[PDB]
Design an enzyme around this catalytic site. Structure first.
Site, PDB file in Angstrom:
ATOM      1  N   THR A  82       3.214  -5.815  -5.095  1.00  0.00           N
ATOM      2  CA  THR A  82       3.713  -5.600  -6.401  1.00  0.00           C
ATOM      3  C   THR A  82       4.235  -4.194  -6.544  1.00  0.00           C
ATOM      4  OG1 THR A  82       1.291  -5.033  -7.001  1.00  0.00           O
ATOM      5  CG2 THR A  82       2.134  -7.167  -7.566  1.00  0.00           C
ATOM      6  N   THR A  83       3.828  -3.329  -5.626  1.00  0.00           N
ATOM      7  CA  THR A  83       4.423  -2.018  -5.447  1.00  0.00           C
ATOM      8  C   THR A  83       5.851  -2.257  -4.828  1.00  0.00           C
ATOM      9  OG1 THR A  83       3.395  -1.329  -3.256  1.00  0.00           O
ATOM     10  CG2 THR A  83       2.113  -0.844  -5.290  1.00  0.00           C
TER      11      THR A  83
ATOM     12  N   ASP B 139      -8.065  -5.351  -6.227  1.00  0.00           N
ATOM     13  CA  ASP B 139      -6.990  -5.981  -5.458  1.00  0.00           C
ATOM     14  C   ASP B 139      -7.245  -6.092  -3.989  1.00  0.00           C
ATOM     15  OD1 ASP B 139      -5.583  -6.087  -7.800  1.00  0.00           O
ATOM     16  OD2 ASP B 139      -4.095  -4.534  -7.190  1.00  0.00           O
TER      17      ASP B 139
END
Lengths: 509, 73, 514, 510
Positions: free
Chosen positions: C81-82, C382
């Site tokens: 998601t980075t 995460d």
């Protein structure tokens, strides 16, 4: 206030600004409209009804655009994107040039002649479709579903629609026109297996008919239609006296048990065990049917009652007196309660009054339920249009080019001063071909040219341009089809919109 | 919340002092040059030594407040 | 009031372009930590791409759209998601050059469709089977934590994360949705993370040292109150006369007395000896008087525990949660093999560990109670979702932009569908991918072209997924080091990037809405 | 921006330039601080007084910044304030100095992330050579000279005029009641200001000091357990007033009779329960006083918020509002209660004798309360430096004499390693040089002269400079042999936290 020239130019812009993105959305290839909120959020849409309602329109002529898409949505629900495109392009091409000379009413007369010209072309171009053969109607539905862009749940929905529409077909009016699809409904059940989707007879109710006592299975007993007046009267059949005294209370109560007693007696004779009362049913009254040994279903809306009446297919009666097997409940009603979940679902099956069906849809959730239900909604619209007029028209811009040369030929032959408006309606048609060219990403010049060439050789029977192959293609071969009636109605509404808007030459508050 | 720093900031603090040092400049004998200091409460005020009136003044610098405090001492 | 055609596409590309800047300095371990005071003014320390989008104030439609699709990715993998943003940005850039020369958006889209199918099949070829051993879980665990914290603190969190997943095999779940209880401890350093097998409790007894080692623990988790003081109530509010309220105060206090008595009878019936202890966990108070009596019998009674502690105990321990006490058999009560109380910081935490029938593990993060202890919480979060994927898929590839150069190379060479219409989007698709490896080099201070020619050539000669050694920013074999990526990470950047792109690409109007 | 979303106040140009320039402004208040100084910083805040400090904790909390980069370091400074005393200033100047040096690196063409990496390395090497800079250590904590040398450095950092008297005083008054080997308490030592008399007239008193005057008889019993009440008297019955004086005359008779009989019961309940010293933050009426003379209870007229606070932490007390009779539950660890005048004002003296949970008080006497607020900074840091939790505190050269030693080792070490890391390692040496610069600025001479002449004498581990004339021209002073020593633990956390703080803030761009 606007006057004169301001108005003619205004019409064309308002139409036009709605159009640009909405034309693109037509076809499997769909551009997606961004709407940006003041809250900084986003709503993304492909559906024409949604775009239009959300935006702020300032101009009264714009509002007329919106309302004609309501007209379309109410009749079908497909082609809703289309009508404003069509209507816009009549005005662009004809109006400003012919105004300077000055003849508005002429452009209008021409529109409706041309409209008739198009209706006649369609019968020749189209071939019949068998309205009792599933396979042949199926491919048509397959074309329409993929506009929305769901293509998984769609496959099931098509088939379930075919039997649902067909079974609610029975409208007589001396000419045997079918618009009946108002007996049809979708019963929604959250939960269960994702693949149990079927049709069952009558009309099935759940929007307020979920109750803990309903007689678990009825496989013989009748439903008794009532809009009675099963509730007590403090006089004979109307209230003449009030309870405010010990003396008034006592006297009145005798009359109240009697009124109830004679009602139940007229209800029981025709043998029910499930009895529906719209309103006019009391806490004392319902207690009387339990004591009559009759399960009572009560305090459920007027809309449910219209639905339950349609399900047995037997007329309603507000008549409190002598309700017979002959008057109410005619035929056999049947009542099944299933617990799908631990929630009571009511099927009412059997309609006498030739047939009737409604749809079971079982999700595994709310979300899973919804996807099928919308795509089924598209589906039963097609099923219906095929039933209505028993010809299927080739899709895309092939139909549009056929009419495009018929007006070139008519307008030359007549050589009126209607000639040039004919020519502007011929070119207004071509937008749908331009939209399909854009969809592949090819130049407008090259593919339109070829299409026009196909008119000259093979008359564009089915040889149009399709936007998912970017080439001239036989539409029959692909399995691209749509029904005649959907084409005709979309065209119809667009001329009305073009004519009405052109009549506004002044806007005055 | 304010913050100020610097070599011109130091110069500020001294400049404030001069202003109070002028109020009391001369009062050793009975000559100098006075102006009657009448308050907003509707009271007229003088004293026999000029440090008295100076005590009443409220200075908006903390650095200038130190010099007020040694007067009181 | 409308941005139409060129003006509509212009707005999206410009936004993607500024955003990209931010979330490249979050990419991999060489990315940089970020804080917000721009979200609300308070001090947050966060280093995840989805999360950072929520915390800020987003009004721009293109930024918002990217944040929404982000939400789905973040749930499943919590890594990549980075990356999501980076691939989106470049993907647009490529498109823009062609449009400006003279190209339609729709042909771009078609070639995206062709692009996506080939690209997904490439994942299937290139995937390398791994085991399900500890060693192999260590390497999914360490690289994912390395994204979200430092290298130093990340190696400590690596141990905690991996033992939990082994324990979850015992329950025979193929998923994780339990053993994710994150509990915080009060400390003066953060370079410890401890694993506690069973549960941990926020507060202990108000009376210390009742029996702070329980050999044989029979856990009654209750939640009715054994303290309600001397307050004058009636139905929980004041009443008109003194006396009417009082009468209830007697019966209420009397009710409490009998319930405290049931603990005394319960210890004989279940226990019978002080060779066994007895555990009480009450989420509500207990009188100071009641603790002394219980304590001598060799009962530890806990006061002021949470509702979250109670649900967790009922799963792990095999316990019950009851609104009564009474005289209950040990068949109903859960058992824990061990209880120990560990006092550290200003708050003492009673551990109830080595539970029989567990399904919840607690990862006990020590920290100073700054934003740093919240930073390891969201790193650890995460890292659990990462090693979950390893259990989901069978196959874990070496990463560090190793996968992405390999996939880009495969597209450039041939037409995946053999048509020119597809080909115009396909170039665009291939160069979009290259952002992820090259930029690790950029952060470090190693020129980007030099790594592309090398990394790609070495693929060709070998058939190795050669990757980037992050620190030098020079290539090295990503397999040995442990810089690895799951099947789910490289799948979900691919799906999110395509879908999000094609709805912004296909704008033709943006018109305001109330 | 290009976006009407994605809010940042830092990033791009503003991360690199603006953040650093802000850290630099906070840390300007500590480039006039740490060791030898004559600086005073006045800060107001509407506290009805002037607040004079040369401590980082009070300066920092007052000052608000709207950027995360500058705001984050204030927390690191507080962290070092809990674990240790003086060196708080040194934590902020270091982080702030390193960040100025950092920005110059960014300029040249070096990347952020390697520079970030090279500090962690330099911090690890500096700590590793740090216990090899031990030159002197305590062994006895009951010996006043070995404790006072340590204390001295905290005091020094405040003013360079109050080093001698105070450093002796604290050790004399004890912070050696605890073993300080596992356990130490710092809320069972307060610094208690007594207004009046000079500050060399600051005295030793053992156990709790409260300023408020004693009334009635005084106790000297060992059954005296403390009972604390914020307000146990206000009049037991409140008046309403109907003639706008009293409601009325026959009623006034009853209001007084009921007060005197309710106060009798309350004060007799205190007497019976074993509470023979009651702390009243209320008001002592004649009726209340008359009762406490009979029962034999030491009575404390008044209390303010500050006085109540120290009772609840030390005693294990609660301060209950009362007008209906109570009983003991505050309890106390204090046996003896004596009476002794400090400042010529009647002061209440609590004492018991034990190691653990034992109490002491560094009590001060001063002209004004402002003069006592600065002195207090010197003294409270001197209690917090005592905490190391050993009796061999491994003293390293105080006063910034270590700093040049660390810098020399680090610059050489930098040369040995290759890559981009090394430049950060060199910068890490020049950040320590911050301390010798600030001592130079107050001393009155430039930076070039001091750093060169400390380097010239090579490895020494004594060299630091004062405010003197000796501190200027030859720029050589002995701060190993002046008994200027600080603790190994104080320098450790200062350097550790500061390196961690500098790395996190250099990362930001949001």
């Amino acid at each position: 206030r606007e006057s004169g020239r301001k108005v003619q130019s205004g019409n064309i812009n308002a139409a036009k600004t709605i159009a640009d993105i909405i034309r693109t959305c037509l076809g499997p290839k769909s551009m997606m409209k961004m709407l940006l909120d003041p809250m900084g959020g986003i709503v993304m849409t492909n559906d024409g009804n949604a775009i239009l309602r959300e935006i702020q329109v300032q101009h009264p002529a714009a509002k007329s655009m919106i309302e004609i898409s309501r007209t379309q949505d109410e009749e079908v629900g497909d082609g809703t994107t289309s009508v404003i495109i069509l209507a816009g392009e009549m005005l662009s091409v004809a109006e400003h040039f012919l105004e300077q000379q000055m003849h508005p009413t002429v452009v209008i007369s021409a529109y409706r002649k041309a409209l008739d010209d198009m209706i006649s072309t369609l019968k020749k171009i189209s071939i019949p479709v068998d309205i009792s053969d599933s396979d042949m109607m199926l491919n048509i539905i397959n074309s329409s579903i993929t506009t929305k862009a769901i293509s998984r749940w769609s496959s099931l929905a098509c088939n379930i629609a075919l039997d649902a529409v067909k079974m609610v077909q029975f409208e007589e009016n001396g000419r045997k026109e079918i618009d009946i699809k108002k007996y049809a409904r979708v019963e929604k059940i959250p939960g269960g297996i994702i693949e149990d989707s079927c049709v069952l007879r009558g009309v099935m109710i759940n929007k307020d008919v979920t109750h803990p006592r309903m007689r678990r299975y009825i496989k013989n007993p009748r439903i008794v239609l009532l809009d009675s007046s099963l509730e007590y009267k403090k006089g004979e059949s109307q209230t003449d006296i009030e309870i405010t005294r010990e003396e008034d209370f006592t006297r009145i109560l005798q009359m109240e048990e009697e009124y109830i007693q004679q009602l139940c007696e007229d209800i029981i004779q025709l043998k029910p065990d499930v009895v529906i009362t719209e309103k006019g049913i009391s806490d004392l009254a319902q207690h009387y049917l339990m004591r009559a040994n009759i399960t009572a279903i009560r305090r459920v809306r007027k809309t449910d009652n219209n639905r339950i009446a349609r399900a047995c297919g037997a007329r309603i009666v507000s008549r409190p007196e002598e309700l017979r097997e002959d008057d109410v409940g005619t035929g056999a009603g049947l009542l099944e309660i299933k617990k799908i979940g631990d929630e009571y679902f009511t099927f009412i099956t059997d309609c006498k009054d030739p047939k009737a069906c409604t749809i079971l849809l079982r999700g595994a959730s709310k979300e899973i339920l919804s996807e099928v239900e919308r795509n089924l909604q598209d589906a039963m619209q097609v099923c219906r249009n095929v039933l209505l007029d028993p010809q299927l028209v080739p899709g895309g811009g092939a139909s549009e080019m056929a009419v495009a040369h018929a007006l070139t030929e008519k307008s030359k032959a007549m050589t009126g001063v209607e000639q040039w408006p004919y020519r502007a309606v011929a070119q207004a048609l071509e937008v749908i071909p331009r939209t399909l060219i854009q969809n592949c990403g090819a130049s407008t010049i090259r593919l339109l040219t070829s299409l026009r060439a196909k008119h000259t050789q093979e008359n564009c029977e089915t040889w149009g341009v399709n936007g998912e192959t970017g080439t001239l293609v036989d539409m029959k071969e692909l399995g691209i089809w749509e029904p005649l009636a959907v084409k005709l109605q979309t065209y119809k509404t667009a001329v009305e919109t073009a004519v009405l808007l052109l009549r506004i030459d002044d806007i005055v508050s | 919340t304010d913050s100020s720093q610097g070599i011109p900031q130091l110069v500020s603090n001294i400049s404030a002092c001069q202003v109070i040092a002028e109020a009391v400049r001369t009062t050793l004998g009975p000559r100098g040059m006075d102006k009657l200091i009448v308050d907003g409460r509707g009271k007229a005020t003088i004293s026999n030594d000029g440090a008295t009136i100076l005590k009443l003044l409220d200075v908006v610098h903390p650095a200038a407040k130190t010099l007020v405090d040694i007067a009181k001492s | 009031e409308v941005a139409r055609a060129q003006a509509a596409l212009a707005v999206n590309i410009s936004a993607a372009r500024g955003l990209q800047d931010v979330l490249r300095t979050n990419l991999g371990p060489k990315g940089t930590m970020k804080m917000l005071v721009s979200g609300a003014g308070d001090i947050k320390l966060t280093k995840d791409g989805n999360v950072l989008l929520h915390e800020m104030q987003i009004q721009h439609p293109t930024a918002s759209l990217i944040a929404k699709v982000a939400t789905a990715q973040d749930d499943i993998t919590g890594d990549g998601t980075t990356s999501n943003v980076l691939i989106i940005g470049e993907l647009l850039k490529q498109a823009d050059l062609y449009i400006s020369e003279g190209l339609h958006p729709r042909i771009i889209t078609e070639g995206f469709e062709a692009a996506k199918e080939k690209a997904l099949q490439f994942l299937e070829e290139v995937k390398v089977s791994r085991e399900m051993d500890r060693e192999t879980l260590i390497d999914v665990a360490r690289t994912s934590l390395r994204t979200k914290v430092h290298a130093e603190l990340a190696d400590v969190l690596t141990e905690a994360v991996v033992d939990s997943i082994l324990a979850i095999k015992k329950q025979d779940e193929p998923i994780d949705l339990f053993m994710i209880e994150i509990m915080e401890m009060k400390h003066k350093s953060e370079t410890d993370t401890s694993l506690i097998r069973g549960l941990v409790l926020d507060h202990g007894a108000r009376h210390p040292d009742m029996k702070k080692r329980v050999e044989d623990a029979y856990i009654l988790t209750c939640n009715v109150s054994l303290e309600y003081e001397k307050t004058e109530v009636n139905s929980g509010f004041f009443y008109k006369s003194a006396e009417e309220r009082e009468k209830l105060v007697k019966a209420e206090r009397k009710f409490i007395e009998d319930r405290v008595k049931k603990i005394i009878e319960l210890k004989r019936k279940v226990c019978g000896d002080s060779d066994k202890g007895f555990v009480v966990i009450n989420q509500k108070g207990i009188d100071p008087f009641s603790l002394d009596a219980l304590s001598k019998e060799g009962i530890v009674a806990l006061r002021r525990a949470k509702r979250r502690n109670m649900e967790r105990l009922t799963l792990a321990c095999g316990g019950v949660a009851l609104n009564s006490f009474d005289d209950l058999s040990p068949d109903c009560l859960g058992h824990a093999g061990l209880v120990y109380e560990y006092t550290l910081g200003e708050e003492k935490f009673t551990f109830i560990e080595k539970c029989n029938n567990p399904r919840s593990v607690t990862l006990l993060i020590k920290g100073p109670n700054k934003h740093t202890l919240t930073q390891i919480k969201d790193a650890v979060r995460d890292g659990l979702r990462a090693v979950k994927n390893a259990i989901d898929d069978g196959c874990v590839v070496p990463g560090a932009g190793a996968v992405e150069v390999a996939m880009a190379e495969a597209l450039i060479k041939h037409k995946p569908s053999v048509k020119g219409r597809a080909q115009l989007g396909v170039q665009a698709f291939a160069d979009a991918l290259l952002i992820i490896p090259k930029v690790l080099a950029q952060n470090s201070g190693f020129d980007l072209q030099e790594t592309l020619v090398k990394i790609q050539a070495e693929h060709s000669e070998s058939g190795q997924l050669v990757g980037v050694d992050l620190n030098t920013g020079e290539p090295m074999v990503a397999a040995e080091v442990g810089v690895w990526d799951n099947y789910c990470v490289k799948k979900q950047l691919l799906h999110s990037c395509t879908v999000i792109a094609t709805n912004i690409l296909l704008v033709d109007e943006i018109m305001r809405a109330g | 921006m290009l976006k009407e979303g994605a809010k940042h106040f830092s990033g791009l140009e503003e991360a690199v330039y603006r953040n650093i320039q802000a850290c630099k402004e906070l840390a300007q208040t500590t480039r006039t601080a740490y060791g030898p100084n004559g600086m005073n910083k006045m800060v107001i805040n509407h506290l009805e007084k002037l607040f004079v400090t040369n401590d980082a904790a009070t300066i920092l909390r007052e000052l608000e910044v709207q950027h995360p980069a500058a705001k984050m370091i204030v927390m690191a400074s507080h962290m070092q304030e809990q674990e240790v005393g003086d060196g708080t200033n040194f934590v902020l100047v270091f982080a702030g100095a390193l960040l100025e040096l950092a920005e110059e690196l960014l300029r040249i063409g070096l990347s952020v992330s390697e520079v970030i990496e090279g500090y962690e390395i330099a911090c690890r090497k500096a700590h590793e050579i740090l216990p090899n800079l031990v030159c002197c250590s305590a062994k006895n904590l009951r010996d006043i000279d070995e404790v006072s040398s340590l204390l001295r450095t905290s005091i020094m950092s405040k003013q360079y005029g109050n080093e001698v008297f105070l450093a002796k005083l604290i050790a004399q008054a004890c912070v050696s009641i605890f073993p300080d080997s596992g356990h130490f308490n710092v809320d069972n030592i307060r610094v208690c200001k007594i207004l009046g008399s000079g500050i060399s007239s600051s005295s030793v008193l053992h156990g709790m000091v409260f300023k408020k005057e004693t009334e009635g008889d005084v106790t000297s019993v060992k059954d005296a357990k403390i009972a604390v009440y914020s307000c146990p008297f206000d009049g037991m019955i409140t008046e309403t007033k109907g003639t706008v004086l009293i409601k009325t005359a026959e009623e006034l008779m009853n209001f007084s009779k009921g007060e005197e009989n309710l106060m009798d019961a309350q004060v007799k309940a205190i007497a019976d329960t074993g509470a023979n010293v009651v702390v009243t933050g209320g008001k002592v009426a004649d009726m209340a006083l008359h009762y406490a003379n009979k029962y034999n209870i030491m009575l404390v007229r008044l209390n303010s918020k500050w006085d109540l606070r120290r009772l609840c932490k030390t005693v294990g007390a609660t301060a209950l509002p009362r007008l209906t009779p109570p009983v003991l539950e505050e309890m106390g660890h204090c046996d003896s209660v004596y009476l002794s005048e400090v400042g010529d004002t009647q002061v209440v003296v609590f004492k018991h004798e034990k190691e653990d949970g034992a109490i002491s008080t560094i009590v001060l006497r001063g002209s004004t309360d402002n003069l006592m607020d600065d002195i207090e900074r010197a003294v409270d840091d001197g209690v917090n430096t005592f905490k190391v939790l050993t009796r061999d505190k491994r003293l390293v050269p105080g006063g910034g004499a270590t700093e040049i030693e660390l810098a020399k080792q680090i610059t050489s070490y930098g040369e040995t390693c290759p890559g981009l890391e090394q430049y950060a390692i060199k910068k890490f040496a020049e950040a320590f040089e911050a301390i010798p610069r600030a001592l130079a600025e107050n001393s009155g001479v430039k930076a070039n002269e001091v750093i060169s002449k400390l380097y010239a004498v090579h490895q020494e581990g004594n060299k630091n400079v004062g405010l003197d004339i000796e501190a200027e021209v030859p720029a050589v002073k002995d701060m190993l042999e002046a008994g200027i020593l600080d603790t190994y633990l104080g320098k450790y956390w200062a350097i550790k936290l500061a390196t961690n703080a500098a790395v996190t803030v250099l990362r930001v761009d949001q």
